[PDB]
Design a protein around this ligand. Structure first.
Ligand SMILES: Nc1nc2c(ncn2[C@@H]2O[C@H](COP(=O)(O)OP(=O)(O)OP(=O)(O)O)[C@@H](O)[C@H]2O)c(=O)[nH]1
Ligand SMILES: Nc1nc2c(ncn2[C@@H]2O[C@H](COP(=O)(O)OP(=O)(O)OP(=O)(O)O)[C@@H](O)[C@H]2O)c(=O)[nH]1
Ligand SMILES: Nc1nc2c(ncn2[C@@H]2O[C@H](COP(=O)(O)OP(=O)(O)OP(O)(O)=S)[C@@H](O)[C@H]2O)c(=O)[nH]1
Ligand SMILES: [Mg+2]
Ligand SMILES: [Mg+2]
Lengths: 430, 31, 19, 183, 427, 430
């Protein structure tokens, strides 16, 4: 039981999924040709005589990134119809990914996903990896998420997305896209883990001492966070945290489900011999502003609910000690209507290490997911960017030329504004 | 400049327009 | 000229509002 | 030239612009498409559809229902090309019949209706529709008032005088309306 | 899958396309007979974006070579990598246009254009999923300019939803070779405004400067110029033909570098370009790539970017690079030069990365700029145009071939309007 | 294809043709008996077995000049039919060659030219070689150009003329004919390269150091200009210029088609050693007042458009540099309404050298064809001489007796005065 289905959309999601599936395979002893010389059930399905096929679906409206996987080292793992690919990409256009280029693939990926779900008996929820700033990852994911919400309904949809950085950006029309997809994440998602690339760059260059890191490193880090999230299904530990009880504890009001993820300890193998990475040390490194996966200041807001996912050699006594210390920190302030503000899941399996990675072999690890109001700041800056370009109606002819309206621009902006205001309001005390 | 004589010719145009429009109706209305 | 302009436009807009 | 956005709107009301019914013919709501004066400073294709259909309907009826039979209301995109190709050719013909008195019509002005270039075409279009109705509703004994208006005078004193005559006519005729409807 | 059909017209366009095909054949590992002999397997993955496959494992370019004089057809056929092209794709006239736009557009090109449309229909239906067209021509003559303009109009009429790229070379006031260049340039720009998706404005004067100052070639020829232009041409579509860490096709670049429909005139550039003697003193890194690519003396169009503001810039990097380095460098460019960038667009730069470096180098970079200073390029022409049209000099050739004076008036007015739009957004 | 038919009329024409055809034969390797032990296709037809018959038609109202050809070294070259002749010359009379005697033999040469034009598939035009001073070369050439314009229509006709000298005149009635010929060269020709003998005499005696030259040297130089004109047709090079390109860039208005031709470098064999005749030097030489082939001062006018035909070892960059230097000169002034006024053609084949010739061997050559208002001066002086003789009605009876009217003289006079006024007008700036 306790299965889950992963949907990897767009190039960002497909590559993040490359990292994620390499990780799961190493974790469970499953070879890239499928064979394994139980727990694997949460991600893999046993196909006849020793063949564990991942419970995932790769999508792109473009052939290239999927072809890398078809010809890669993991060709014998995914079964051919799981890898769905189109002909021409959305080309950095929400309207293409959603309305014109998107409608041709949607029934195919939906048929595949339904066939995937008819094989699992305790489906927990969907994990959707994508990117806000892209064309496919924004529009086609909007479409897919709306359709999934109609069909399955009460299933929990968790999305892990690459939110656009403040200064470092790769595309020009990016703000536009990032706004329209918000109109979906409010309604058709249950918990949205936004992650910025600039923050992971700073994490790499400060912690792992990698001067020039590429997308593979960042994808390894995101994969590690995902593994830490679902370990409580895949392993046994002192305190397990499901997905439903996790969502019960982390989300106080329906609209408020945009927590921040942070993994620790992320150090190079060399500074690791000198560090005494106790439970307290990594527990505290989680609450530092420099170890954040998104560019924001936790000091600039108040926390609402935190979940600590400990992995490895962790006893409950020192967890209680560390949580009491954090409680006695004034730089870390909390809302008042959450007197107890910590969920604790403790797990036995230490974090596995991928060959060729930068992270070391450590015994204890923490994944902290914190619903803080400070995330509002992020949205703020992106909105400002929008209102620059939209003031001239720049690039809008591409969108309205593809089946969009301007009313949708206006509605998406009004929605993001109401979301920000709801965050600012929930923050305040009484 | 020309912009003011164009303003004048436009307003003359509007006067002529609306006047003829109400004339063609009042001639109908009186009969 | 501006005075005739104003009287003009005002009479125009207000007479348009006649039912 | 701010009055260009001004006289246009007034001239828009001159043709009897009712923002409600003319939005009702397109089957869309008003709240999503603002009308008035400050409507074409930015790309605004919905107000474009509405004003252009009203302006083409006010001048012609049968041929308008013909050339815009497979187009209006152009809600989709396959049928949109029909609207954009039925209107551009007509505007090109109209501009070629008048020549220098009109801006050269370009289909690119229709890919994004907005900015001063679109407002210029729109004002000259409104002028043309006004004039070709001053050519038909003015009396056969007064058709010259039309060409008297096409005579591009250059001196301000005569412009003053012409406005003067027209405005006294305006006062007297609006007064006679009151006499006829009350007496 | 995302096939590109290429079109050459005129002597300039034909020679530049010949260089382009030489370099691209070298890239995918095609030899002068069409027989694949490369080492890596990647080279065969997406060979089909440019090369049809004929029987016996030979590859034929998906190109249509057009002209009005057969001399250019013979010259292209006789060059190296000349025997690749299909013989049925050489569509030539018998006279030449005589630097007359009216002859290329109305009299002879009008009669020849049907054969060209037939060949492009055949080639395009032959392809699986077309993604657009590439017209390599010059704007100064009659065949190139007017013929390619008629061709572009017809193509857009038949395939309205495709991409339309042009690597048009523009006249330059200093290095001028024809008396009637302003007329043809204006009349062609008027239609390029409407019927194309993105126009890469090259200029011979700029390439001469690149060669004289940067490469320090004592006597540059047209070969070196065409080599630079072909380098940019292939650099644009590397991502179509090869994998990478952040892909970017042609519609991606179109959606990112064009804020409004009319503003699709770009200036290209390339890096690294070093001499021979100065080579061993250079560190081929990402900082040096970006510093060279954002320099004004490296642009392939004779317009100074310091006189305007970058509406948008695209950088396509090739090789094994870090993304932290690329992004830090782009942010550095933007922050140090904050005045050369408009304010109602945050993050003007789009970046893409391909994993395969060009032939012989370990890494490279291609630059595309949508800047307001390109308006200078047009103002020059306009001035010259007026200076002639006022007196109606050389007008009787264009008139005797069936044109009008009203057409010259419209062309001038449209060029003025494009200039006004750019200047307006410059602020 | 790309064939051109070169008509040689009158004594001067037939002799300049002897020169031109010697040159072309030696150029394409075609021996004087026609055999060659492609390019030749423009000037030769390949009849039967390696036998090449030139596409020329030698005419004259006198047989002796054609009889020397028929008895000379090239008797085996022109097949007999093309060397058309009458019985009596026009005796320096326009009325005889045009009306009296030309009417008997216009039809013969017309039949021959029609035969020639039928055999070519890519006719470019006609190259009429004649003199203005004689009776045949003026009268019969006028009649021929009239009939050819009626017959062939839009075919371009380039005439190469021997105009009288300001000082040295070998004929007395010469101005008369030279004036009547104008009435044709205006309407029926497309480009007229007038050349004066006195200027070639001065060029010889100064540049070539030939103490007393005869007509053979002059004809050699003229043939060199003709070959440089047609080189872009016969051989291949960097930038190519057809005949229509030439006419488009060189002719600003219909009535204005009288360009000055000049050549560089014409040095001795002995002087060529000490000089390094690079591109810059020959390009500056083309613009020198003493190197023109017609007597006039180009400083006294304004250039309207000029075509540079470079030949040999010529790269484009130094062509550009030399042209820029010509631009930054103050004495070479250009009309304002022609801001870009240089056409450039570059051919790869260097100029050949005839045995026994006077020119040396050079690796670069330049033929400059310039439209400058200065040529008006030429007409002026000759016109004055006309206005002198018509003052006394001298020699007029010889014209009136053979069918000419004095009204025709008055008419030619008015026409040439109008042409001068047109040049004076087109010169002026706004
Ligand atoms: N962390 C991370 N970010 C990526 C990756 N690939 C792309 N991105 C980022 O995601 C955004 C672009 O998203 P894309 O994947 O290129 O867009 P898309 O889903 O392909 O939609 P299309 O434009 O149609 O291809 C930029 O921030 C990119 O820098 C990746 O592998 N890892
Ligand atoms: N440059 C040059 N001028 C020549 C040559 N032969 C004759 N002329 C000149 O041409 C002018 C006379 O023209 P001609 O050709 O002799 O007269 P024509 O064509 O025979 O006509 P007729 O008088 O009827 O015999 C004089 O200036 C002659 O000196 C020549 O070979 N070269
Ligand atoms: N970069 C480059 N520029 C060229 C080349 N050939 C010509 N040009 C430039 O192009 C312009 C003329 O191009 P050209 O090829 O003559 O056009 P065309 O239309 O074929 O000329 P035509 O048949 O009407 S007479 C000139 O400005 C010249 O400098 C070339 O091979 N490379
Ligand atoms: Mg050519
Ligand atoms: Mg004689």
């Amino acid at each position: 039981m306790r299965e889950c289905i992963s949907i990897h959309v767009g190039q960002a999601g497909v590559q993040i999924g490359n990292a994620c599936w390499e990780l799961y395979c190493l974790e469970h002893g499953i070879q890239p040709d499928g064979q394994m010389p139980d727990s694997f059930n949460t991600f893999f399905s046993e196909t006849g005589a020793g063949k564990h096929v991942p419970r995932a679906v790769f999508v792109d409206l473009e052939p290239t990134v999927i072809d890398e996987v078809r010809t890669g080292t993991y060709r014998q793992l995914f079964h051919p119809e799981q890898l769905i690919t189109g002909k021409e990409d959305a080309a950095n256009n929400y309207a293409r990914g959603h309305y014109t280029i998107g409608k041709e693939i949607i029934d195919l990926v939906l048929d595949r996903i339904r066939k995937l779900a008819d094989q699992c008996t305790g489906l927990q929820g969907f994990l959707v990896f994508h990117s806000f700033g892209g064309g496919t990852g924004s529009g086609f994911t909007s479409l897919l998420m709306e359709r999934l919400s109609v069909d399955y309904g009460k299933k929990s949809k968790l999305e892990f997305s690459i939110y656009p950085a403040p200064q470092v950006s790769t595309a020009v029309v990016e703000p536009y896209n990032s706004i329209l997809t918000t109109h979906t994440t409010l309604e058709h998602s249950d918990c949205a883990f936004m992650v910025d690339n600039e923050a992971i760059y700073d994490i790499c260059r400060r912690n792992l001492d990698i001067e020039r890191p590429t997308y593979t490193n960042l994808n390894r880090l995101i994969s590690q966070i995902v593994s830490s999230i679902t370990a409580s299904l895949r392993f046994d530990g002192a305190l397990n945290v499901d997905l439903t009880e996790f969502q019960t504890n982390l989300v106080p009001y329906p609209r408020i489900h945009f927590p921040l993820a942070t993994y620790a300890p992320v150090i190079s193998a060399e500074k690791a011999y000198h560090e005494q990475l106790s439970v307290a040390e990594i527990t505290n490194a989680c609450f530092e502003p420099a170890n954040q996966m998104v560019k924001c200041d936790p000091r600039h807001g108040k926390y609402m609910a935190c979940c600590l996912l400990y992995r490895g050699d962790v006893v409950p006594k020192d967890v209680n000690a560390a949580i009491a210390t954090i409680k006695t920190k004034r730089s870390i302030q909390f809302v008042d209507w959450c007197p107890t503000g910590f969920k604790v899941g403790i797990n036995y399996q230490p974090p596995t290490v991928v060959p060729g990675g930068d992270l070391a072999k450590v015994q204890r690890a923490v994944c902290m997911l914190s619903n803080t109001t400070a995330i509002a700041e992020a949205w703020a800056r992106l909105d400002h960017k929008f209102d620059l370009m939209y003031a001239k109606r720049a690039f809008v002819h591409w969108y309205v030329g593809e089946g969009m309206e301007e009313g949708e621009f206006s509605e998406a902006r009004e929605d993001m504004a109401a979301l920000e205001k709801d965050y600012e309001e929930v923050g305040v005390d009484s | 400049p020309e912009d003011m004589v164009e303003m004048i010719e436009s307003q003359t145009l509007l006067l002529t327009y609306l006047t003829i429009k109400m004339q063609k109706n009042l001639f109908r209305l009186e009969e | 000229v501006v005075t005739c302009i104003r009287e003009n436009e005002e009479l125009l807009k207000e007479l348009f509002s006649s039912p | 030239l701010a009055w260009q956005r001004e006289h246009m709107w007034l001239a828009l009301q001159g043709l009897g612009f009712e923002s409600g019914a003319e939005a009702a013919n397109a089957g869309k709501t008003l709240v999503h498409v603002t009308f008035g004066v400050n409507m074409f400073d930015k790309p605004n294709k919905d107000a474009f559809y509405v004003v252009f259909h009203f302006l083409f309907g006010k001048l012609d009826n049968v041929r308008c229902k013909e050339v815009f039979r497979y187009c209006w209301p152009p809600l989709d995109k396959k049928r949109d090309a029909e609207f954009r190709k039925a209107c551009c050719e007509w505007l090109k013909k109209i501009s070629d019949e008048v020549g220098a008195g009109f801006p050269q019509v370009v289909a690119s002005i229709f890919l994004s209706p907005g900015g001063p270039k679109f407002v210029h075409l729109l004002y000259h279009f409104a002028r043309y529709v006004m004039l070709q109705h001053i050519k038909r509703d003015a009396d056969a004994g007064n058709v010259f008032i039309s060409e008297a208006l096409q005579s591009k005078i250059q001196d301000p004193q005569k412009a003053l005088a012409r406005n003067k005559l027209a405005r006294q006519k305006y006062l007297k005729v609006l007064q006679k309306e009151n006499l006829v409807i009350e007496e | 899958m995302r096939e590109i059909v290429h079109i050459q017209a005129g002597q300039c366009g034909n020679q530049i396309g010949a260089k382009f095909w030489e370099v691209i054949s070298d890239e995918h590992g095609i030899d002068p007979t069409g027989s694949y002999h490369g080492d890596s397997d990647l080279q065969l993955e997406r060979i089909n974006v440019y090369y049809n496959e004929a029987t016996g494992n030979k590859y034929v370019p998906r190109a249509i070579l057009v002209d009005l004089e057969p001399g250019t057809m013979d010259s292209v056929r006789s060059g190296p990598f000349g025997q690749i092209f299909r013989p049925d794709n050489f569509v030539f006239g018998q006279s030449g246009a005589g630097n007359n736009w009216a002859k290329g557009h109305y009299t002879e090109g009008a009669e020849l254009v049907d054969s060209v449309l037939d060949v492009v229909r055949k080639e395009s239906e032959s392809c699986d999923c077309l993604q657009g067209f590439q017209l390599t021509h010059s704007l100064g003559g009659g065949t190139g300019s007017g013929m390619g303009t008629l061709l572009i109009s017809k193509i857009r009429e038949e395939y309205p939803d495709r991409i339309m790229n042009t690597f048009s070379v523009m006249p330059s006031p200093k290095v001028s070779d024809t008396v009637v260049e302003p007329y043809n340039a204006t009349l062609s720009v008027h239609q390029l405004v409407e019927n194309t998706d993105e126009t890469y404005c090259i200029d011979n004067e700029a390439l001469y400067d690149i060669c004289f100052r940067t490469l320090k070639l004592t006597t540059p020829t047209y070969g070196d110029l065409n080599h630079l232009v072909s380098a940019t041409m292939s650099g644009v579509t590397t991502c179509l033909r090869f994998p990478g860490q952040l892909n970017a096709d042609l519609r991606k670049l179109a959606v990112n570098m064009v804020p409004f429909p009319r503003l699709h005139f770009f200036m290209p550039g390339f890096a690294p370009l070093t001499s021979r003697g100065s080579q061993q003193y250079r560190a081929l890194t990402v900082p040096e790539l970006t510093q060279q690519m954002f320099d004004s003396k490296n642009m392939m169009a004779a317009c100074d970017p310091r006189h305007g503001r970058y509406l948008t810039v695209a950088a396509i990097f090739r090789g094994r690079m870090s993304m932290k380095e690329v992004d830090e460098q782009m942010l550095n460019v933007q922050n140090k030069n904050s005045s050369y960038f408009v304010e109602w667009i945050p993050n003007n730069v789009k970046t893409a990365v391909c994993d395969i470096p060009p032939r012989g180098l370990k890494m490279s970079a291609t630059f595309i700029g949508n800047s307001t200073a390109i308006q200078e390029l047009f103002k020059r022409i306009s001035e010259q145009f007026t200076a002639m049209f006022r007196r109606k000099a050389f007008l009787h050739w264009y008139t005797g071939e069936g044109m009008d004076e009203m057409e010259f008036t419209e062309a001038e007015s449209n060029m003025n309007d494009l200039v006004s739009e750019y200047q307006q957004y410059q602020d």
